[PDB]
Amino acid sequence: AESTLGAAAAQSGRYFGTAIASGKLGDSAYTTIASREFNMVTAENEMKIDATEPQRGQFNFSAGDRVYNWAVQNGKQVRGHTLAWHSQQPGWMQSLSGSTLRQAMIDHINGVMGHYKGKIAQWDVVNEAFSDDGSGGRRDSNLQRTGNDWIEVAFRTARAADPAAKLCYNDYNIENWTWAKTQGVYNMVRDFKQRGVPIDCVGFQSHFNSGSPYNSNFRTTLQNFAALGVDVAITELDIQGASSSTYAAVTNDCLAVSRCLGITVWGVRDTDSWRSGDTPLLFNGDGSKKAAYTAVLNALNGGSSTPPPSGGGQIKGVGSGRCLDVPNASTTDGTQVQLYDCHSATNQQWTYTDAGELRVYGDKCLDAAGTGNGTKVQIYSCWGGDNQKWRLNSDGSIVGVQSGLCLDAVGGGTANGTLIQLYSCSNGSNQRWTRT
Amino acid sequence: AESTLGAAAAQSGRYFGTAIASGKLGDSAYTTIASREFNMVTAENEMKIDATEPQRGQFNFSAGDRVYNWAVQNGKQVRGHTLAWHSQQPGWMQSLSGSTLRQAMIDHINGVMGHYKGKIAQWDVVNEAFSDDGSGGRRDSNLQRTGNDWIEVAFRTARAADPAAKLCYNDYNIENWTWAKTQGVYNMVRDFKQRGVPIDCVGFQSHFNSGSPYNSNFRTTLQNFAALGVDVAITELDIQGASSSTYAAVTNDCLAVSRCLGITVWGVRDTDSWRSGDTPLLFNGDGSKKAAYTAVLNALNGGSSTPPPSGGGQIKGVGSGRCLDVPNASTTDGTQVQLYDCHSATNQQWTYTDAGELRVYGDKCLDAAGTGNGTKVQIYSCWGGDNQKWRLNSDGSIVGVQSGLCLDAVGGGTANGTLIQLYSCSNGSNQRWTRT
Numbered sequence: 001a002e003s004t005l006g007a008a009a010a011q012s013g014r015y016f017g018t019a020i021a022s023g024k025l026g027d028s029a030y031t032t033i034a035s036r037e038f039n040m041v042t043a044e045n046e047m048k049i050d051a052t053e054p055q056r057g058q059f060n061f062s063a064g065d066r067v068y069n070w071a072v073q074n075g076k077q078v079r080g081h082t083l084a085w086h087s088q089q090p091g092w093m094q095s096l097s098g099s100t101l102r103q104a105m106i107d108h109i110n111g112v113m114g115h116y117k118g119k120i121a122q123w124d125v126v127n128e129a130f131s132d133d134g135s136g137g138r139r140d141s142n143l144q145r146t147g148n149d150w151i152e153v154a155f156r157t158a159r160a161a162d163p164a165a166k167l168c169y170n171d172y173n174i175e176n177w178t179w180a181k182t183q184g185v186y187n188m189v190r191d192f193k194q195r196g197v198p199i200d201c202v203g204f205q206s207h208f209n210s211g212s213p214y215n216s217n218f219r220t221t222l223q224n225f226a227a228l229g230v231d232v233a234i235t236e237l238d239i240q241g242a243s244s245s246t247y248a249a250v251t252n253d254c255l256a257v258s259r260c261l262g263i264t265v266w267g268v269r270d271t272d273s274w275r276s277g278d279t280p281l282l283f284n285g286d287g288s289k290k291a292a293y294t295a296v297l298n299a300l301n302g303g304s305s306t307p308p309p310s311g312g313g314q315i316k317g318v319g320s321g322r323c324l325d326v327p328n329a330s331t332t333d334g335t336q337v338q339l340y341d342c343h344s345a346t347n348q349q350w351t352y353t354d355a356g357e358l359r360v361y362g363d364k365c366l367d368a369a370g371t372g373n374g375t376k377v378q379i380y381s382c383w384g385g386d387n388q389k390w391r392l393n394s395d396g397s398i399v400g401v402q403s404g405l406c407l408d409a410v411g412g413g414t415a416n417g418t419l420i421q422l423y424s425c426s427n428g429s430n431q432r433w434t435r436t
Numbered sequence: 437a438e439s440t441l442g443a444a445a446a447q448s449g450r451y452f453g454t455a456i457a458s459g460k461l462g463d464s465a466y467t468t469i470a471s472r473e474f475n476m477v478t479a480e481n482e483m484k485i486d487a488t489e490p491q492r493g494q495f496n497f498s499a500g501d502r503v504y505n506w507a508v509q510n511g512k513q514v515r516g517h518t519l520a521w522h523s524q525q526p527g528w529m530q531s532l533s534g535s536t537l538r539q540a541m542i543d544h545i546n547g548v549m550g551h552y553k554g555k556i557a558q559w560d561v562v563n564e565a566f567s568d569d570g571s572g573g574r575r576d577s578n579l580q581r582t583g584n585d586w587i588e589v590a591f592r593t594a595r596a597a598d599p600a601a602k603l604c605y606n607d608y609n610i611e612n613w614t615w616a617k618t619q620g621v622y623n624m625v626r627d628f629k630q631r632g633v634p635i636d637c638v639g640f641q642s643h644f645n646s647g648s649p650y651n652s653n654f655r656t657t658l659q660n661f662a663a664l665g666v667d668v669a670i671t672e673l674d675i676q677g678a679s680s681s682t683y684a685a686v687t688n689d690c691l692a693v694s695r696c697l698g699i700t701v702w703g704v705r706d707t708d709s710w711r712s713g714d715t716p717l718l719f720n721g722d723g724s725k726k727a728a729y730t731a732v733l734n735a736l737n738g739g740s741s742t743p744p745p746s747g748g749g750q751i752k753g754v755g756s757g758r759c760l761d762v763p764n765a766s767t768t769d770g771t772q773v774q775l776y777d778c779h780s781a782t783n784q785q786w787t788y789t790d791a792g793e794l795r796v797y798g799d800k801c802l803d804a805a806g807t808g809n810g811t812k813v814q815i816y817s818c819w820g821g822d823n824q825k826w827r828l829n830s831d832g833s834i835v836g837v838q839s840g841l842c843l844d845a846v847g848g849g850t851a852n853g854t855l856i857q858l859y860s861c862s863n864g865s866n867q868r869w870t871r872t
């Protein structure tokens with residue numbers, strides 16, 4: 001299996017999940033994508049403190065079970081999120097402190113895990129317990145104020161409530177190894193494992209953006225925590241701008257770590273994202289697969305037999321043996337591309353960008369004017385439109401994000417001058433290409 | 437004078453307008469921009485057929501007058517749009533055909549022009565009467581079916597109704613001289629002039645996109661029509677992607693033809709556009725100027741006597757002599773840029789794209805991780821965010837679209853290694869940059 005993210009991940013014993021919003025389970029466009037692509041589910045909000053215990057001692061597992069049931073019935077495991085957190089607590093808990101609060105925490109953990117006992121693969125017992133000031137220490141919350149040992153207490157309680165569930169510590173900004181926050185969490189987990197504190201995994205939310213960008217050392221971070229004897233999981237992945245290279249990089253980081261259980265992206269479509277403005281997911285609002293989607297799938301499936309091109313290269317048709325060429329090195333918008341004998345020349349040098357464009361001359365983009373069969377493929381000023389974004393299938397076909405159609409050599413032409421158009425993908429040789 | 441589009445355009449004896457939507461005049465941010473930048477107004481829908489004559493014989497100018505009143509109150513002239521058209525006809529007119537339709541057409545023209553008699557600078561008497569099948573013939577509508585002479589009849593009627601108004605024939609896809617449609621309208625206009633049919637102008641909608649891309653021959657198209665003895669006007673300008681170069685090219689084409697009266701963009705902010713999806717206007721949804729706005733303004737002001745860096749190039753600050761440099765030529769996202777001795781290296785080669793980005797390495801973008809003062813300017817994967825878009829002002833300053841702040845060398849730094857940040861513009865030497 002390797003046509004969907006979930007199946008591709010399963011090949012290596014891993015999973016590819018998402019965050020499910022109970023309210024969207026009635027939207028077939030939403031559920032059609034979610035049920036097909038993912039084999040792990042996290043309730044976006046339905047299993048949080050305020051949602052499961054609106055009143056102390058008064059547990060409401062309605063919305064939560066709705067998500068749990070849908071997940072299991074559709075062949076997905078579940079990550080419980082989350083049991084002890086300073087954020088999203090019921091109004092009553094936000095007022096508690098010291099001994100009373102500590103007690104409420106314990107009770108809550110027992111209540112939720114009791115109800116779900118033996119059904120949850122991973123539980124984010126404690127979430128975001130460290131600050132971002134740079135000190136590398138605990139953030140000041142009513143929870144921390146109950147004593148520095150709360151985290152440890154939460155995990156012991158957790159193990160007790162349900163020993164079959166993997167207990168994780170979940171946080172954000174602990175992906176970059178050089179960051180103090182990261183080191184603070186690292187030391188704690190090292191401490192816990194040495195003292196025998198029950199903790200089985202560390203969740204790296206992985207919310208990357210210009211404020212806190214992804215860094216290649218992320219893999220080093222995972223390997224380090226892995227060496228401590230705890231599993232690692234990418235829990236809430238979303239990348240501002242959904243760069244193909246970054247998504248693929250995070251994917252390979254997990255595949256490179258034997259203890260990395262899997263990857264979960266925080267949402268289905270960009271429009272479902274808590275940060276839609278950053279279009280940080282793998283699917284467009286119209287449900288179409290984004291450039292990064294294919295980048296992730298290809299990574300999960302084992303990459304290419306030959307190391308991919310590094311900016312600026314040729315694209316020759318398999319059936320013709322000729323290259324994607326812009327007639328007479330023209331640079332005027334609207335010029336339809338053709339096939340031509342391969343040779344070193346700017347008008348045959350295409351660069352695949354992280355945004356999914358196929359650039360030429362530096363600021364011109366492979367462009368599709370329309371979404372139907374026969375649409376001419378031309379060059380046009382780059383502007384980021386979905387009709388200028390393409391997915392590089394591992395089978396050699398290049399699919400337009402917006403149209404869902406393949407680059408096609410008209411009438412299966414192989415001669416110089418054959419024009420390129422969009423057409424239903426057919427696996428024909430006039431729809432397959434190799435990049436250098 | 438030269439700070440706003442209207443005032444700049446006025447320095448060449450031309451106007452710069454927009455399309456106003458009555459339902460948006462209650463939006464303060466919209467009116468603030470609209471009132472400041474344009475001196476010519478077109479009702480986006482309020483003066484159309486269905487809006488001005490709901491039932492046959494019953495005129496209604498409430499919606500049209502709201503726009504008109506606002507236009508005059510803010511010192512703008514008005515273009516009446518539109519009197520005879522196959523589209524947006526009220527249902528009672530859609531039902532008409534033959535001589536009944538012909539007289540209805542005439543009756544509509546007299547009623548609307550009568551109401552606005554002496555108040556309209558230009559009237560789009562007839563709109564989109566030519567086919568779009570690429571043959572250059574008449575569009576098949578109930579109007580055309582009343583007889584080939586309907587257009588002529590509309591103009592003669594219009595002249596008599598308000599002799600003070602300039603009578604225009606408006607249409608789209610008539611910008612590229614090679615298109616059959618463009619030639620068909622030319623032939624018609626030429627025929628009207630030779631036979632004495634009253635027509636004073638031809639409006640070129642200029643709705644450019646990858647399906648109907650702007651072409652440099654547009655200038656000849658304008659010249660050709662101008663030669664027939666009529667004025668020309670870019671009436672509904674918007675460019676898919678809003679390329680800075682294309683917006684500048686169109687502007688220069690109009691300024692190159694003495695008979696080109698002015699330029700009207702079809703909307704204020706991209707969010708106000710009938711095609712927001714193509715982010716085709718000059719202003720963002722938050723009201724900030726796009727890189728294309730600056731390009732248009734600079735062109736209106738005559739541009740620079742020194743050609744911009746055609747692909748690649750360095751950026752050197754005046755009060756620093758140093759060139760924008762990426763530390764150790766790194767390629768890691770989040771790397772704050774600095775100033776340094778201008779050497780021949782790629783980590784100093786910045787390309788200003790038509791989308792407004794400052795790219796280095798081919799696919800890395802000058803990025804702003806915030807909007808406030810002090811925000812560190814770094815490089816990040818290009819994805820199109822406004823925090824990656826920049827405007828190159830004529831005063832040598834580079835201001836961030838999203839932030840509205842200027843690139844600034846920390847504490848007036850000038851020595852190698854000075855970090856770059858975002859700070860309120862100040863004409864300070866540590867905020868002016870030169871490029872060659």
Ligand SMILES: O[C@@H]1[C@@H](O)[C@H](O[C@@H]2CO[C@@H](O)[C@H](O)[C@H]2O)OC[C@H]1O
Binds near residue numbers: 212
């Ligand atoms: O609620 C939390 C956010 O406040 C948090 O914000 C992060 C702060 O550090 C910045 O560098 C990040 O870019 C920004 O996302 O993110 C996690 C969320 O749970």
Ligand SMILES: O[C@@H]1[C@@H](O)[C@H](O[C@@H]2CO[C@@H](O)[C@H](O)[C@H]2O)OC[C@H]1O
Binds near residue numbers: 044274
């Ligand atoms: O719908 C929103 C959720 O998507 C959001 O989820 C949180 C995002 O930041 C992460 O650090 C947290 O772990 C995660 O739960 O919470 C707010 C809710 O309104």
Ligand SMILES: O[C@@H]1[C@@H](O)[C@H](O[C@@H]2CO[C@@H](O)[C@H](O)[C@H]2O)OC[C@H]1O
Binds near residue numbers: 408413
């Ligand atoms: O170049 C285009 C061909 O690639 C295209 O091929 C069709 C693909 O779908 C199959 O079911 C058809 O049998 C096959 O001909 O045909 C159109 C042509 O322009």
Ligand SMILES: O[C@@H]1[C@@H](O)[C@H](O[C@@H]2CO[C@@H](O)[C@H](O)[C@H]2O)OC[C@H]1O
Binds near residue numbers: 608643645
């Ligand atoms: O209603 C009109 C549209 O039908 C028209 O559509 C254009 C047709 O030619 C294509 O090449 C263009 O891309 C497409 O926009 O555009 C103008 C609009 O008023």
Ligand SMILES: O[C@@H]1[C@@H](O)[C@H](O[C@@H]2CO[C@@H](O)[C@H](O)[C@H]2O)OC[C@H]1O
Binds near residue numbers: 608710
């Ligand atoms: O709000 C929309 C208007 O912006 C739109 O305006 C028309 C666009 O196509 C041009 O060819 C026409 O001349 C112009 O009036 O009309 C539809 C309306 O919903």
Ligand SMILES: O[C@@H]1[C@@H](O)[C@H](O)OC[C@H]1O
Binds near residue numbers: 181
């Ligand atoms: O320690 C971290 C520091 O290295 C980074 O630059 O900014 C965030 C801090 O938490």
Ligand SMILES: O[C@@H]1[C@@H](O)[C@H](O)OC[C@H]1O
Binds near residue numbers: 325326327328340347
């Ligand atoms: O684009 C083609 C060019 O690359 C080749 O060299 O000569 C023929 C052109 O059509």
Ligand SMILES: O[C@@H]1[C@@H](O)[C@H](O)OC[C@H]1O
Binds near residue numbers: 762763764765776779
């Ligand atoms: O980035 C700088 C590099 O471009 C220069 O050559 O040497 C000093 C570095 O800091």
Ligand SMILES: O[C@@H]1[C@@H](O)[C@H](O)OC[C@H]1O
Binds near residue numbers: 844846
């Ligand atoms: O360089 C900055 C200067 O331009 C501004 O005026 O004041 C703050 C400084 O950091």
